[PDB]
Design a protein around this ligand. Sequence first.
Ligand code: HEM
Length: 397
Amino acid sequence: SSMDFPLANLFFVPSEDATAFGRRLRAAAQQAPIVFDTAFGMPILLRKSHITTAYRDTATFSTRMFQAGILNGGLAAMQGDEHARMRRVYNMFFLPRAVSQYEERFVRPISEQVVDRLAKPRVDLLEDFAMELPRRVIGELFGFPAEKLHETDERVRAMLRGLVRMHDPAAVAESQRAYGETLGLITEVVERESRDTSDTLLGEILRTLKAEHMDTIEASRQIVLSLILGGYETTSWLVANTIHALLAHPDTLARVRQDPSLLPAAIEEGMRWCPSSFGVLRMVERDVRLDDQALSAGTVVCLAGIAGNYDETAYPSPEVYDIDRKPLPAANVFGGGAHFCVGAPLARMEARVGLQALLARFPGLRAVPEERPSFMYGAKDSVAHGPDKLPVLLHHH
Ligand code: HEM
C-alpha cells in the first residue's frame, strides 16, 4: 500500500554475482529514496536518514504487523515497556560469558564432528555444512535429535515466508498451518526440558524465564520458536554467504586459514558484501512525511538498511570483498534500534567457530571451478539472499 513511488524489482532477481543484490539496492537508492517493490509487495525505504530515524521512532514505525501472525506473543511483536522487559530477559542468554560456554560445550565439538563428516563423494557446503551445523547446534541446545529438526525445514521456511509476504493471504495461511504442524514438536521440547529437573541450555533458559516470573506456555513456545527460526534457518545463510565470500577470494581465504583471528572481520565484511537479509519490516502508525515522500498510517514498509552496504562514500570500492576495512562495517543485517537481533552474538560465534573448523580441516578447500552459484533473495524459498549451492573440492592442498 503506497503512492507516488517508482516500481522496482530488487529482490527476486537471480545473478551469478553475489554483489548484484547490494548493487541493485544501492542503485535504486541513488534514483529514489522509496520504491515500491512489486515482487516483495510494499514500499522499500532505501535512504539512510529515513532508516536510522525509523529504527529509533518505534511509535511511528512499529512492529505491530507481527501481532497478527505466528510471532504474536513473541519478543518481536512486543512494543514499548513490555518489549523492554522481555528483551532484558532474552539478553541474559546471549551475554559473552554464556556465549563462550556454548562455544566450548556445543559449537566447537559439533562443528568438528560436522566438518570431519565431509571427508563424502560430492560436497556442497550449503546443504552439508552451512545448514548442518546450525541445525545440529540447536539440536543439542534442545536435547533433541537433529534429524527431527531437519524434517521441519519446509515448515520453517513456510512460517518465515508468511512473516515477510504478509500482503499475501496464501503465504499467511501457510505460515499459520506450518506453525500448527510444528506446535507438537515445540510443545514436546518444552515439556521435556521444563521437566522435573534435567539439563539443556534450554532448561537453563526456562528456569530463568520462571525465576523472572515470565513463565507462560506462550513465552516458552516463542523462545523455542526463536531458536529455530534464527539459530537454525537464518544463521545457515550467514554461514553460507561468508563461505562463498572466502571461496570467491582464495588469497583472502588463505590469509584467514593462516591467521584465524581474521575470521570476525571476514564475517563482518561478509555481511556488508553479501548480506543474507534485507533489514526489517515496520508498520507506519501515523501519516508521515520523509522529505518529499509521504507514507500513510497502516502501510507496512521495509527498511532496507543494507542499501548502505554499497555506499561508495562509506565503503570505497564496495564491490570488493576487503576484510581489512576499518573500522569494520556496521552490520545492517541484524536490524537496528531496540529490536536489533538479540541472537547476533550466537550467530557470529557459530560462523566463526564453524569456519575455523572447516578451514583447519581442509587446507585444500576451494570452489568447484565452473559451477558458479546463483544468488537471489528468496533462495530455496527462504527469506534470505544466498547461493543456491556451494560446490567445493576439499583437496589438493
Ligand atoms: C542465531 C540465533 C538467532 C536468534 C535466537 C535470533 C532471535 C531474534 C529475536 C528474538 C529477534 C527479535 C528481537 C527483538 O525484537 O527485540 C531477532 C531480531 C532480528 N534478527 Fe535474529 N536471531 C538469530 C540470528 C539472526 C541472524 C543470523 C539474522 C540475520 C542475518 C538475524 C536477523 C534478525 C533481524 C534482522 C532482526 C530484526 C527484526 C526487527 O528489528 O524487526 N537474526 N532475532
